[PDB]
RNA sequence: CGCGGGGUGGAGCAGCCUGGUAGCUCGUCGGGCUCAUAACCCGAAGGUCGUCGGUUCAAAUCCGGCCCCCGCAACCA
RNA sequence: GCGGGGUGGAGCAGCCUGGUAGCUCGUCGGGCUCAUAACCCGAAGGUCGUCGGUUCAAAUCCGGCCCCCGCAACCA
RNA sequence: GGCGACUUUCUGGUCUGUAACUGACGCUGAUGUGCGAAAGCGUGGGGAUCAAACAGGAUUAGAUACCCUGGUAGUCCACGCCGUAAACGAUGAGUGCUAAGUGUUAGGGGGCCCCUUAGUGCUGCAGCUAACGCAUUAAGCACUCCGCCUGGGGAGUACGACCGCAAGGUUGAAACUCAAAGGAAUUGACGGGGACCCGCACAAGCGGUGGAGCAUGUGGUUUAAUUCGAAGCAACGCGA
RNA sequence: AAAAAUGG
């Protein structure tokens, strides 16, 4: 009921409302993952950089638990604790072999909703 | 709407122990500039609390404001969140002093002289009013983190 | 009649599985907050766990009697 | 004919199960405003439809008088 | 009106240079006849996203909204219909003439430079304008033709006619009513506009008032009189 | 980037 791995990947997802953390191998599969809901962060808190870097380092030790020693970091979203996370992952122990922003560029396809007035 | 930051003013040390912190606390206790009284009932305090710790009364002193001296504070900045904000050295003596005076005039012995030595005595040991104070002033510190 | 489940601060839910410790969300009180108001943050009081017994150093927790509520099922004076 | 109801100014609880009149709005006083509204704090306001009965004690239980609501009023 | 991935097929217009060719064949254009954003309508198809209506959740005194979660028509396609927009450069078309500076698109001629044609921008004389501004892409100087206006409201309404499946479109008054409606520009004042500054304005503190007895002024009420004045800050231990 | 109406 344990597993081992050495190199793995990191996937951020940071929106303006929270921010979500989680390891998997080189072929995509779950082993923890942490968010700033889950480490109870409510409203204007999850988006703040400390609850990403709290939710990274969560995940960061549960996966050195499992036995990950490199990860590559994978970005997605525009939010404001992406920068948080990859430093609590350097801290962490884990080595970041490389960063690279995967958030989809949308072509011209979809509709985007209506612009808020408020 | 202001020019700038006034001097600050320098008291002169306890003639006994020469102590500018033990000034203070005596400014602090006074009302109505009865600085004899203030004198009094502080001396009385030290000696009471010298006779029930058998310690030095400005290391039980000390160790009582170094307990009841806070580290951070919650200011309100602005979209307007409390934001956790180190205290200056002299706010940590100027809050040290005033939560120590305000609860001791609270406790329930009968005279001022003793709610003092009560109060410095429970704050050396960590478990006074004043210590609840900081206790609660460092936690919701530490809940508005985020917003540092 | 048989089998299960439920009864816990003023309300709504955990903790029972596997013995210690009464937790969580609302509600009331005090404080921070603001031009007030809301929201938000921090301190308190709030049930001794349906009731009576039993085994243990120790019972909301384990075992019985009893009082209600719910689900399904049984019922040829 | 049979049921149900009548409680501060309005609307609605309380009745079942006698000893305890609650909520929202409204009214009045103080506050906030240049003033009104909104809002905050505090207060007053119902002999429980009206007469009798049982009870130590009746909004409550029982019987009449009144008023309102609903249903019924069929076969030639 | 509009047209933005790429490929192929069919097809319209525009610009530049010669001066073989026709030899005024031109301009405008009532009535006509066509195209014409978006929404909308009909038949059939399609349906991701977004999203009228609608349904919850919030906000609020209320909130048939703004915000949140969904969500049908529609948004898409073919063929028909509708024919309207702040369909705007709020500027009809054609032609010629009138200082300059500078960018850019497609060309052409002459030695990186000069000249030139047609567009597309910016700045700027004369002139024009109520002013703002326009200014070889005129809102200048002129000539031709067309459309359109004659104070505001009533009213793009009523009636009639034509058109449309419908929604509606086109055309289009009057009674009555007012002494104003308007344009540009100016000085203030104001803004839940901006910038920069002040003040116990806030912040950091200390001490009070609002509760009690009493002193005092004022309101009210009483009285024969309770003399008059002061009324938000700037009346109420005020004239006194 | 919450809500804060009105005034012959
Ligand atoms: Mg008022
Ligand atoms: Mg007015």
Same mark, same amino acid.
């Given at each position: 009921?344990?597993? $081992? ?11 303006? $409302? ?6 998997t191998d080189?072929? %995509?599969? /779950?082993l923890?993952?942490?968010? /700033?809901? /889950?480490?109870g ?6 988006s703040?950089?400390? &609850? /990403? ?5 969560? &995940?960061?030790?549960s996966?050195?638990?499992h %036995? ?8 997605? %979203?525009?939010?404001? %604790? ?16 490389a960063?690279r ?18 | 709407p202001r020019?700038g930051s006034?001097?600050?003013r =320098?008291?002169?040390? =306890? ?11 005596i400014?602090?206790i006074?009302?109505?500039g009865?600085?004899?009284?203030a ?12 006779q029930?710790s ?19 504070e ?6 307007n ?26 406790r329930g012995?009968?005279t ?15 478990t006074?009013?004043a ?11 530490e809940?508005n983190?985020?917003?540092?």
């Amino acid at each position: 009921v344990k597993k $081992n791995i050495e190199n793995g990947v990191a996937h951020i997802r940071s929106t303006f $409302n929270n921010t979500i953390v989680t390891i998997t191998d080189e072929f %995509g599969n /779950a082993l923890s993952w942490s968010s /700033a809901g /889950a480490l109870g962060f409510k409203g204007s808190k999850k988006s703040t950089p400390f &609850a /990403a870097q709290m939710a990274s380092e969560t &995940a960061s030790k549960s996966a050195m638990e499992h %036995g990950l020693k490199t990860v590559e970091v994978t970005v997605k %979203g525009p939010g404001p %604790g992406r920068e948080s996370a990859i430093r609590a992952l350097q801290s962490a122990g884990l080595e970041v072999t490389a960063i690279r922003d995967v958030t989809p560029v949308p072509h011209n396809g979809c509709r985007p909703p209506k612009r808020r007035r408020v | 709407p202001r020019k700038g930051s006034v001097p600050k003013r =320098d008291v002169l040390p =306890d003639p006994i122990h020469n102590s500018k912190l033990v000034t203070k606390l005596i400014n602090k206790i006074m009302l109505d500039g009865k600085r004899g009284t203030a004198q009094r009932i502080l001396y009385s305090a030290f000696d009471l609390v010298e006779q029930r710790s058998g310690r030095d009364a400005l290391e039980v002193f000390e160790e009582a404001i170094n307990n009841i001296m806070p580290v951070l504070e919650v200011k309100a900045r602005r979209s307007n969140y409390q934001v956790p904000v180190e205290v200056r050295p002299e706010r940590r003596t100027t809050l040290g002093l005033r939560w120590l005076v305000n609860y001791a005039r609270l406790r329930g012995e009968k005279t001022m002289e003793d709610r003092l030595a009560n109060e410095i005595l429970d704050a050396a040991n960590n478990t006074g009013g004043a210590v609840k104070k900081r206790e609660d002033t460092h936690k919701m510190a530490e809940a508005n983190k985020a917003f540092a």
